[PDB]
């Protein structure tokens, strides 16, 4: 038979991702490695960034993209003693997850709870690990705090809103199109704001003149500066994405050097006088901290088993319609996770 | 009868004058109280303030000083938690370098029976700073490694002691080689001679990845060195400009490095009485539990305020430098 997979063959529009095949050879994973068949693959903003050549560490083209997936183990290499054929597992990697069969280090896989579906598992890792580390490891989210979650209807955003509810009395401001406000309030947003029909900075200050304690910034650019200045004493803005670029254009423009005009910069003296902190985060740029990531996953699985987090699914697309799947996200039409299925 | 120090201009040590006014009948307004100080703390912030570098500093002439410890002699209406005779420590923007002072009651805290005025006067500024830098911004966690600059200073020592309340924290502290033994004693895992060896190099020998938290009271060119010494998820927190007596980063750079840069200054913290009060409550509990002990370097009467400032400006102090009204 034949195993299918998606291949990025160049940088540019949606048409640069091609569906290709390959002969299914018998599984022979080396030591400490696992071979598995995927049932669902996650789509992340970092994938759109990769596709336009903005990712400093995407392996040499052509390559199969994708950072997360969920599936079944069909083969285990020598050494590994906590995984067996037939185990349902979710997996995290730098690339290569958008295909039917993957071989990876066992330590990069995690057991899926019995009650969790493959779809939920594929929608969990990247979004919730990011939200968790942004809110807790950097933000040090505390009871009585107020948070601004940009793109609150997106995967990370929805994960962030849900996590904010696991802490007492946290006021959540969330930005997204008015058309999604109802879903925003149902997920846990306190004050939904349409950054397209209003000025979100003013809209937040009318309600909380002092500002907020944490700003989650997946936008970057001139929005980082607005986040920083929206901070209350002891607050922090955490940048984990550059949506103000990777979104909109179907092909990257080299006149993005102009983008420099809007890059946010800070001096220690400014931070000192304002009692603020600016932080940066990207799971795709996190260097070999398996023990750190693993501890976070465990926390998330416990929250799941207790009914406190539930990955919401926006849509599921077959490898054949990857173009539309990427469009769903880039055009900001999704409410929840966008997944791909073999 | 009552003495008080006054900053009559921005300059060196000579700018601080010692005046004396007659004792008037205490008349605390609503929610405020009056107290007689027994000890006043000396901080770097005061040297900056005296150098015309503090933007929240009242108009000259003014009495400098952020902390003191003393006895309550009069309470106003509304205040039901204080009575004449109570021993308290107090935090303020200024005005603490004098014998008598009137302040908002919510800015004072009761001193434990076992703690002395001297210790109380050495507690607030230094330990609140170390606590909020290590926990609020740093989010200190077990198994973490921390770089404490000026480990033998007031904030430095408070920090080392606070790191020891969290399990398995590795502490790198810099100071004169002649202060290394007192460093080991206070809890420093790896003392570094700032003056003879490159601390960046000395630290990477032991921990290649770097450290989780860098405490920067120096500022200037050390902020940058601290930044590049951070492990993933690490943060450098600047709370002083001690070198003055530059560093610049973009959000994109932070994103690709998974790092944070923070700034702290108890003097620019506005109206956050609930926040600070929360920290002091935890600091007191630790003292009663025996986890913190403010160390006093030297005590000076108001007449020798110059010597007190000089003592700290020349980095001769190992612990807190204090001021006492002194003998008549």
From Swiss-Prot, chain B:
Main localization, broad class: cytoplasm
Highest taxon above the source species: Eukaryota
Keyword annotations of the record: Acetylation, Cytoplasm, Membrane, Mitochondrion, Mitochondrion outer membrane, Oxidoreductase, Phosphoprotein
Subcellular location(s) per record: Cytoplasm; Mitochondrion outer membrane
Any GO molecular function: zinc ion binding
Stimuli inducing this protein: Increased expression in glioblastomas and on wounding, in basal keratinocytes. This expression is calcium ion-dependent.
A Pfam family assignment: ADH_N
EC number annotated for this UniProt entry: 1.-.-.-
CDD domains: MDR3 (cd08275)
Expression tissues: Expressed in brain. Also expressed in glioblastoma cells.
Listed GO CC annotations: azurophil granule lumen; extracellular exosome; extracellular region; membrane; mitochondrial outer membrane
GO terms of biological process kind: negative regulation of mitochondrial fusion
Protein's membrane topology: Peripheral membrane protein
EC class: oxidoreductase
InterPro entries per record: ADH-like_N, GroES-like_sf, NAD(P)-bd_dom_sf, PKS_ER, Quin_OxRdtase/zeta-crystal_CS, SV-ATPase_mito-regulator
PROSITE patterns referenced in this protein's UniProt entry, alphabetically: QOR_ZETA_CRYSTAL
PANTHER family listed in its UniProt record: SYNAPTIC VESICLE MEMBRANE PROTEIN VAT-1 HOMOLOG, SYNAPTIC VESICLE MEMBRANE PROTEIN VAT-1 HOMOLOG-LIKE
Family in the record: Belongs to the zinc-containing alcohol dehydrogenase family. Quinone oxidoreductase subfamily.
Role this protein plays: Possesses ATPase activity. Plays a part in calcium-regulated keratinocyte activation in epidermal repair mechanisms. Has no effect on cell proliferation. Negatively regulates mitochondrial fusion in cooperation with mitofusin proteins (MFN1-2).
Protein name: Synaptic vesicle membrane protein VAT-1 homolog
Organism: Homo sapiens
